[PDB]
Design a protein around this ligand. Sequence first.
Ligand SMILES: [Zn+2]
Length: 250
Amino acid sequence: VGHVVAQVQSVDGNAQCCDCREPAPEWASINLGVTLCIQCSGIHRSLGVHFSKVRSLTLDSWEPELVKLMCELGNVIINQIYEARVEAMAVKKPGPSCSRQEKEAWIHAKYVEKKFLTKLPLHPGALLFRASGHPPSLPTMADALAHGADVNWVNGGQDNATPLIQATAANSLLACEFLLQNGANVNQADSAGRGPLHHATILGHTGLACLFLKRGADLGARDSEGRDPLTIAMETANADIVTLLRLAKM
Ligand SMILES: [Zn+2]
């Protein structure tokens, strides 16, 4: 709520549109972590939610975690990834005055075709998994995802844990939020049937528990020990999480 557009635009390179450098962009992509002008945000709407989730900095409400998330990413960071090879390819980015068509071609090459990426972010999924854990590196998570990292990557042969479960073990609201904006299944369990909600409640992370409930975590899911999150909350003597879970059931 605290002027979102002022705060988000005050971040490194966020006062130029990410795709065409149009000044004072008032739009955003919340899974990418970037600001966009009227023209480029309109084009992002073309791509679909898998590539880009468009929001207004001035006209839409913003959850505080999400503002903070925007502040750890930003145009400079994201362009270091998505436009990494532009200089080496000798190709020319659009400016503010360019044709809709020219911006369309650039945006599609950049985000769909992934044409300007470096070759390596060798294992994008494992990199995402590592970068989501304590202490998380959101630029590294962004780089891994741009290189095709599965947001629901399973750490096989080991514990079958996911990046979301790692971000949960790290107590990282930001990394959790980032993964969820990028399609993480809030219900995907590890080998012991313990989903992100189970982990939040094992570790006494009330904020993360509340985050997962807001995003449709299954209240009734039972782990390999037959425990749902309420049972873990009782057994850990955690009055706040018991309260949450009981309220969520109502
Ligand atoms: Zn633009």
